[PDB]
Every structure is written in C-alpha cells, then in structure tokens.
Symmetry: C3
C-alpha cells in the first residue's frame, strides 16, 4: 500500500509520528503487514481547493487489490478523520484518489509482484 498526501499545511504543523500513525492505521485498514505500507507527506505546497487557500489536501492510495466501492468509502472516513484531527484540514477540502494496481505493474526489489 502506498499513501501520498500533498498539503498547504506548514511542515511545522505535521505532528511527529504522523507517518507512523498512517502506516499503522493503513495496515489495519487494508489488512496488509505494516512492512508493505509506504507513506509520503508533502507539506508547504502551493495549492488551492475551490479557489481557496484554506488548509486542503490532495492524496492518493495505491494498492494491489484492497480497492473497491465500500472499502474506498471507509478509507475516506479513516483518512479524512486523520487529516482533520492531525493536520486540522476540513474533510470537504480533501480529495483522495484510489488506485487498484495490477501486480505486474508494481515494481519492487528488482522485479515486480506478478
């Protein structure tokens, strides 16, 4: 699983341990070992959501499987919850793109997962 977060929130506002919490919560949520989970936080971005510069986030979750209608719906609750509580970003100023990656299309350790 790979979670990326781009946000206008300053680096200083990213709580220590945020990456750890995301790895842990996403591991539970997807049912994958934490060791397979990679997380990326990109703060201080030049962004606008709806033409406003208020705190917002553009994210994406890539996963070989574990992506689907109902699952994505609960990932959004989990993720928006985390972003709201930890980064103080309003849930309606967050977009999360979900990608069900094919194993043959995910390279890792000199090969792919196919």
């Amino acid at each position: 699983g790979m979670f990326i977060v781009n946000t206008n929130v300053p680096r200083a506002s990213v709580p220590d341990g945020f990456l750890s919490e995301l790895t842990q919560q996403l591991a539970q949520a997807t049912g994958k070992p934490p060791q397979y989970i990679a997380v990326h936080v990109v703060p201080d971005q030049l962004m606008a959501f709806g033409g406003s510069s208020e705190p917002c986030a553009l994210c994406s979750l890539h996963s070989i499987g574990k992506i689907g209608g109902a699952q994505n719906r609960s990932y959004s609750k989990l993720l928006c919850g985390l972003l709201a509580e930890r980064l103080r970003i309003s849930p309606d100023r967050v977009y999360i793109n979900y990608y069900d990656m094919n194993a043959a299309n995910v390279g890792w350790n000199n090969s792919t997962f196919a």
Copy 2:
C-alpha cells in the same frame, strides 16, 4: 477536477494569482463549478525533458468524467497556453496526463462520490 503541475521554473516566476486563473479556466473548460476544482503547483523541481534542463512541466488532470479524445485535445491547448504565457515554458516541453476517475475511486469528505 484536480490539476497538478511539476516544473523546474523557480517559485519566484510563478505569478501571483496563477492558482486562481487555473481554477477559473479549468472550471469553464470542464463545465464544473470552481469550488470542485483543486490546483497544485510544484516549482523548483529537479527535472529534465528530452535530456534538457530548459523550462519544462509534467502535469496531470484528474476528473470524474469530462475526459475524452476531443476534450483532452482542447485542454492541452488551454493548459499549454497558460504555462507558456504565465511560466514561459515552451509547449513542446510539457506533458499532461489525463485521468478519467471513476466516482467510486475519488474520496472526499469522509466518503466517495459513488
């Protein structure tokens, strides 16, 4: 709609208001209310296009629908036009990836659009 721009152009060369102009032009171009449009500009990047370090840009437009052969062709005119005029990037040093997102795959405000 979500528009991202990665470019080697310095932050100082990004005109104030560029994010607003993008929001407005993309809203018109896609026929979506400006409030649904999110824009992201990432300057000062370590990039190379064709092996050259001259100003270039790697972009992506994600949209639930409003993506297609003809539409994408005019988006490129609009976007390359804006990048050329506002960031002085030559149109032939710009790649834009278009993504027709499924509503069930776009999370927002604790749920998805499905």
Copy 3:
C-alpha cells in the same frame, strides 16, 4: 516516457548527471528517442517504507505502450540498480508503479498523441 522518483535521500546525495543517466538508460530500455523521455527527481521527502525512515523511494513510469509483464520486470532491475548504485537505496525499499498510457490521454504541445 516519464519517470518520477520521490525519495528521502538528501538533495546533496543526488549525483550530478543522474537525470541524464536516467534519460539515457530509459531511452535504451524503452526503445524511444531520448528526446521523448522526461525525468523527475524529488529528494528530501518526508517518507517511510515499512514504518522505517531508512533510504527508500516511491517511483512511477508512464509510457504510451512499452509497458507489460516482462518489460516491467526488467525495468525494475534497471531502475532499482540505478537507485541502489547512485542513491544507495536498498532495492527492497523501492516501489515503482507502471502506467501504460493511452495516447488520447497524454497531452503534449497543444494537442494529444491520439
């Protein structure tokens, strides 16, 4: 072809010429003229792979065609090889997403490739 690399490795650790080597190796590997190859390196990122902050990388290769089971497998060898040798990132701390882009979905120079 478009190759992006996000890594926690410091900017100072990115060897001069790395972008050039990537452009050249990817050109050979995909069988495309170097002029069509765009490369992007994003260092100093706040990342975690498996909950660890040791050097890691999250990458993606987008290409109109030239994407497939066997090809992706050798791209991973090539790419992990380069990342390991030039950025000292362990191959098992690298994820590379492969995207076979439809020509109608790749904008360039005021139009698309369709």
